[PDB]
Amino acid sequence: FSEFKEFLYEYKVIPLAIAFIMGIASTALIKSFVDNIIMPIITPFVETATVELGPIVISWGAFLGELVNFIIIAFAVFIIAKKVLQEEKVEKKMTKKVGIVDTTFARVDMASIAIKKLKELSPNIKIIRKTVPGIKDLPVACKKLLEEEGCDIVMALGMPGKAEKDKVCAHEASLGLMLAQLMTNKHIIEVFVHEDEAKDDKELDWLAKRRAEEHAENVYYLLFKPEYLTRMAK
Amino acid sequence: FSEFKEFLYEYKVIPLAIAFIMGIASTALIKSFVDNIIMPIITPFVPGGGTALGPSWGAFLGELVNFIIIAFAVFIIAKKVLQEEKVEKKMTKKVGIVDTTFARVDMASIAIKKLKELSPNIKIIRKTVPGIKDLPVACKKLLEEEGCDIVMALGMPGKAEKDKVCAHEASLGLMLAQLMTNKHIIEVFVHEDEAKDDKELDWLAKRRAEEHAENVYYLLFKPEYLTRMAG
Amino acid sequence: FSEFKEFLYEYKVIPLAIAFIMGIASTALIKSFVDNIIMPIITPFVPGGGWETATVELGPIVISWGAFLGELVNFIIIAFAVFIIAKKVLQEEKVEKKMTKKVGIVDTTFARVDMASIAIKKLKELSPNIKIIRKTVPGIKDLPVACKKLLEEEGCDIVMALGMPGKAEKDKVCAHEASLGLMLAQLMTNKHIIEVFVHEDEAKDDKELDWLAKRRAEEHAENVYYLLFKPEYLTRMAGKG
Amino acid sequence: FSEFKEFLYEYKVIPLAIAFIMGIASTALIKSFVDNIIMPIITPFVGPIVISWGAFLGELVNFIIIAFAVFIIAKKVLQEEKVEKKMTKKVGIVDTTFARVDMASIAIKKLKELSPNIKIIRKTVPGIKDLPVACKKLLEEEGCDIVMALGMPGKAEKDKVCAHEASLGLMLAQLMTNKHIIEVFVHEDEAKDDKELDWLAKRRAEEHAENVYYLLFKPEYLTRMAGKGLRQGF
Amino acid sequence: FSEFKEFLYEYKVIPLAIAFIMGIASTALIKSFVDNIIMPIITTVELGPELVNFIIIAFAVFIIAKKVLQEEKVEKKMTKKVGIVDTTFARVDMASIAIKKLKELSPNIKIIRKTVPGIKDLPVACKKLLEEEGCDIVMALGMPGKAEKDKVCAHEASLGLMLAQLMTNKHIIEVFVHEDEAKDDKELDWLAKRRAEEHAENVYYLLFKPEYLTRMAGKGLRQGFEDAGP
Numbered sequence A: 001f002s003e004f005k006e007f008l009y010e011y012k013v014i015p016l017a018i019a020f021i022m023g024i025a026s027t028a029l030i031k032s033f034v035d036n037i038i039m040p041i042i043t044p045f046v047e048t049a050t051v052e053l054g055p056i057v058i059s060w061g062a063f064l065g066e067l068v069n070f071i072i073i074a075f076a077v078f079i080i081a082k083k084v085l086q087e088e089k090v091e092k093k094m095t096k097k098v099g100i101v102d103t104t105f106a107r108v109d110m111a112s113i114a115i116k117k118l119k120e121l122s123p124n125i126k127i128i129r130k131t132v133p134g135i136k137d138l139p140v141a142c143k144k145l146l147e148e149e150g151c152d153i154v155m156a157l158g159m160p161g162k163a164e165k166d167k168v169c170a171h172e173a174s175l176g177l178m179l180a181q182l183m184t185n186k187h188i189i190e191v192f193v194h195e196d197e198a199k200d201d202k203e204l205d206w207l208a209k210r211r212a213e214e215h216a217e218n219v220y221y222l223l224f225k226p227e228y229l230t231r232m233a234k
Numbered sequence B: 001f002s003e004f005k006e007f008l009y010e011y012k013v014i015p016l017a018i019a020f021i022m023g024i025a026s027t028a029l030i031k032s033f034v035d036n037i038i039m040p041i042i043t044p045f046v047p048g049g050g051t052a053l054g055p056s057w058g059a060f061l062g063e064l065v066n067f068i069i070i071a072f073a074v075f076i077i078a079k080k081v082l083q084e085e086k087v088e089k090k091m092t093k094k095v096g097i098v099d100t101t102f103a104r105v106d107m108a109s110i111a112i113k114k115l116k117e118l119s120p121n122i123k124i125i126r127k128t129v130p131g132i133k134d135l136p137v138a139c140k141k142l143l144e145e146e147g148c149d150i151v152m153a154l155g156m157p158g159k160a161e162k163d164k165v166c167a168h169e170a171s172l173g174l175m176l177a178q179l180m181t182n183k184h185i186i187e188v189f190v191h192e193d194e195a196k197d198d199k200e201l202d203w204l205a206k207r208r209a210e211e212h213a214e215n216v217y218y219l220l221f222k223p224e225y226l227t228r229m230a231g
Numbered sequence C: 001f002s003e004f005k006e007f008l009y010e011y012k013v014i015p016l017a018i019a020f021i022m023g024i025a026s027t028a029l030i031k032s033f034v035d036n037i038i039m040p041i042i043t044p045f046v047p048g049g050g051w052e053t054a055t056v057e058l059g060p061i062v063i064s065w066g067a068f069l070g071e072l073v074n075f076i077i078i079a080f081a082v083f084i085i086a087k088k089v090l091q092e093e094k095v096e097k098k099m100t101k102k103v104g105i106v107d108t109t110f111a112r113v114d115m116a117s118i119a120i121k122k123l124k125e126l127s128p129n130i131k132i133i134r135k136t137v138p139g140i141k142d143l144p145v146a147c148k149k150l151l152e153e154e155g156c157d158i159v160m161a162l163g164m165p166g167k168a169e170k171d172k173v174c175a176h177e178a179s180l181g182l183m184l185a186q187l188m189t190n191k192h193i194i195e196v197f198v199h200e201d202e203a204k205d206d207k208e209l210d211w212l213a214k215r216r217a218e219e220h221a222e223n224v225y226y227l228l229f230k231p232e233y234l235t236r237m238a239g240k241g
Numbered sequence D: 001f002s003e004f005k006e007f008l009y010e011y012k013v014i015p016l017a018i019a020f021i022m023g024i025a026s027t028a029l030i031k032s033f034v035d036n037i038i039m040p041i042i043t044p045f046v047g048p049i050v051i052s053w054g055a056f057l058g059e060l061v062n063f064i065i066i067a068f069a070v071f072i073i074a075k076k077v078l079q080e081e082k083v084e085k086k087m088t089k090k091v092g093i094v095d096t097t098f099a100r101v102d103m104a105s106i107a108i109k110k111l112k113e114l115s116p117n118i119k120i121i122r123k124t125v126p127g128i129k130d131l132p133v134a135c136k137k138l139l140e141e142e143g144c145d146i147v148m149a150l151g152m153p154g155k156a157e158k159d160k161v162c163a164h165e166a167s168l169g170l171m172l173a174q175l176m177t178n179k180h181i182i183e184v185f186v187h188e189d190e191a192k193d194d195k196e197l198d199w200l201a202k203r204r205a206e207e208h209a210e211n212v213y214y215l216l217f218k219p220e221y222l223t224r225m226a227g228k229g230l231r232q233g234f
Numbered sequence E: 001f002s003e004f005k006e007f008l009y010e011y012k013v014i015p016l017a018i019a020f021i022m023g024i025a026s027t028a029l030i031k032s033f034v035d036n037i038i039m040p041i042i043t044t045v046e047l048g049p050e051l052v053n054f055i056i057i058a059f060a061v062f063i064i065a066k067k068v069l070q071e072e073k074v075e076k077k078m079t080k081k082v083g084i085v086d087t088t089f090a091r092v093d094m095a096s097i098a099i100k101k102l103k104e105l106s107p108n109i110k111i112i113r114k115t116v117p118g119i120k121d122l123p124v125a126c127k128k129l130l131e132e133e134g135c136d137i138v139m140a141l142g143m144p145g146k147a148e149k150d151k152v153c154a155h156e157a158s159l160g161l162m163l164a165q166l167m168t169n170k171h172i173i174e175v176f177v178h179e180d181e182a183k184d185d186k187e188l189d190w191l192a193k194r195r196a197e198e199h200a201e202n203v204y205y206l207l208f209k210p211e212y213l214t215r216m217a218g219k220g221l222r223q224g225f226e227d228a229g230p
């Protein structure tokens, strides 16, 4: 019996049942709105037709009549459909939550340097953070967010390594990044910063955080002010 | 209570309630289209006339056949409708062009010029992004939400024996996006290791931008052209 | 009006409404086949035996099944009859439809010598019941989407990748890049896709290359055919042919 | 007749027959809950300038009210649905046979260690070029709310391809389902002798086993570790 | 008219229609088994101060589902089809060496071959088998080409092979056997099949025998030239 609770969950039998009951309840519902409003009032009172075919066309005539009846039934339905549409196009637009994703592996915490330049430009940016150990483990992560919490765009916060060989990891992670993106439309902002881009510790420090902002920057534009970059089109 | 408004939204209880009820209206409708038309009169056709002791399968057989015709006729009608729709793909919808904030020479225009010319009937849309490495989730957005049945990929690569990865990196996301949804996004790359000075680069850049757009027209309306070109 | 009509489009509600109605037609349809043909014929208990009066007697009271069995077994008989017809129909469906049309051969705008024809020739020869669709493209880095559609939005149970890569130790990348698409292509859908690459480094002059290009397309087509029909040929061919 | 068994299998007519019947049982269930609980108390005892009018409208509101009941019931069923015992859960580790050091246990130790209620699950395979379908399955057909990439690399300038290859798929596998597949690679070109490799190995084995624990329950930790240090390894 | 027979197929309208009707049949049946059959013989706390009744009946149905699941589980188990795919570009038939060793480790492994001509192709095929026949695994016994340029192919194919697996929960045993691992013909030949069998070997295991591999652990097992210890 203690294995039984597994089928309900993996299969989630409850979710389907409910969703339809609102199907039946949610549709039987929208119906009387047209059945008991929309129609009797917006249709009462309102062809002169004799012709050249028959009577097997009287079949055609009967057909025409039926069509008209349906139309009375059906165009009302169409109208109701239209009415529903207007609400759905109503909602909220571009004043959303941007989440930023980070590395324990990397050296120079850049979660802030950006979180700042961004909250600044716009206070109403409910931010969300999540961290992973490996440069190569942000992906699942960033998506999860893009998939389960608006996170309507994100930043790739972290640093790569040294030596000729570790060049692979960047390529590799990035492929999966682009992918995460494509698996769901929403640019995940790659915030990469290779270490071989300095000559000491201090030099690199500046380089990261400075960068870490310029992007939290473009985040704004690709969020609320498109034209700008449009203009920044060298 | 201010919590309930959340369930209704996440699950979208309305989107289903509508779509299903529409079905009944949308099915009941077309039904009489045959129940009361193509049947009551197209009937004097094919009694058919005259397979496998004590014996009503037949009279029923005829009825079954009629129903098949009505069903088969419905299928035919559906096919016709599809074709009609598909004529809509004889008629056009539009180009799409995506641009960088990383580029050094704005192709965008050089291109848009050679596109409205060869064909005025082309309602262009522009959308930009910062990094080479992004184009895709965008390239895909247009193509996923807005028509744009083709899209020029406007961008410029970098230098150094090390920034050749970007090209490889991005190109894949491209075909990916491509193969994500049947749309030929022409990669409009222009590496910076293809010159000696500034002016030289410039000419090379915009010049190409056209050659592709050039083709963009072709892939659109004039396949044969490319056809003969082969090879 | 117009706006609404646009609204109607895009989502493809029509698809549902059609298929939806269709089920009703299709269902009510096959039913008639049983309600009046398969069943009003299949109903003597006989022949066949082995029903049960497994000492129905004083229990004091164990029964529930006998009646149920009778009624049930009676419904099973009807369901069972229906099932058989379905299988028969399926059998007919399989065995009948070798009627087949379409190969599909996509080409370059990049390449220097037209293969397509070289390949097309041998193809219809190997069998003239092949419906060929040629469709070209400009950059070698394109075919993918294309081949894809040919395999998705038309039958083309296969296709040829007649194409031509470039020179220089740098344009080697393209081949790689493209091949992948090709796979993604292939992998996106269960239709093999010969890759008709040839690189331009495989020679010392113009004429040499020319022979080489066409020579292959043919070879390929060759397999196309078996690959379409003659799996047995190749079956043996392992180990160098 | 020995051919019939095929149809029943290929189309799986049983699964539907069950799920379908289940729906009826599952729906009537949720119904009685409203029809007989949420309503028979939670809601009881609580001229026109006319035309078609005031009986029409009045019936419209009643018909609307019934929908509210249904909505309430739906809410109730959703609510009962718990966030209970999420996090706890099962780990599971995958291993190699193309490998040279059994890391498997190394981490296994550190793990049950920091937390005893972590039923672990093992399974293995031949080379590196495979693990994927494995991990996937696990992460897919059992909880394994994450898992590790326990496996060994290789040495010649050519076998480098292996990591690249497998991994691209790790990321896919991960992408393909929102779970962390912790990559536990240990390149053999990171040593000068046998014993040397050995340590670096099992040592690294614990270094992420550790991160599993955090990533499972301890999130804030990695948060804070943030930008600072921790290259899980040498 | 000669165009419609296409639609019925691409969509396979009938298979559904059938399955659909069967559902009603398949369901109504089991019903009588409970409505009519299991029930008529049969007949949490507090606050002083029908839903339970409904739940009782509902509960009863639930059990039936698990019984049915068990029943389904009884008819066939981890004892079937392999179905190897092989090369045509190949320099030596690998298929036989493992096909042999396979039937050995046990006869209950209906083998189902097939081949193709270019090394890159397989993927689709390999996929196809896994998907449209219960090849609950498969090999691929490839072979690559020479020169320091063709190496690309192996990568290319493999990643696809890789998705192949990824698209479907079934172990693809790539079997790549490069030709830069020899000095002459005969040498390579050996390396070749030899390796083939070894993989077959694991294949017996990966299917039924999982403990075997478990123990191997980090211990040696380096299929190839000369098994390299732990």
Ligand SMILES: CCCCCCCCCO[C@@H]1O[C@H](CO)[C@@H](O)[C@H](O)[C@H]1O
Binding pocket: B019, B020, C016, C019, C020, C022, C023, C024, C027, E016, E017, E020
């Ligand atoms: C997309 C929204 C759907 C919500 C869930 C209800 C699914 C509607 C499917 O209809 C069913 O389709 C079958 C296929 O033809 C028919 O056999 C059957 O008669 C019909 O009932």
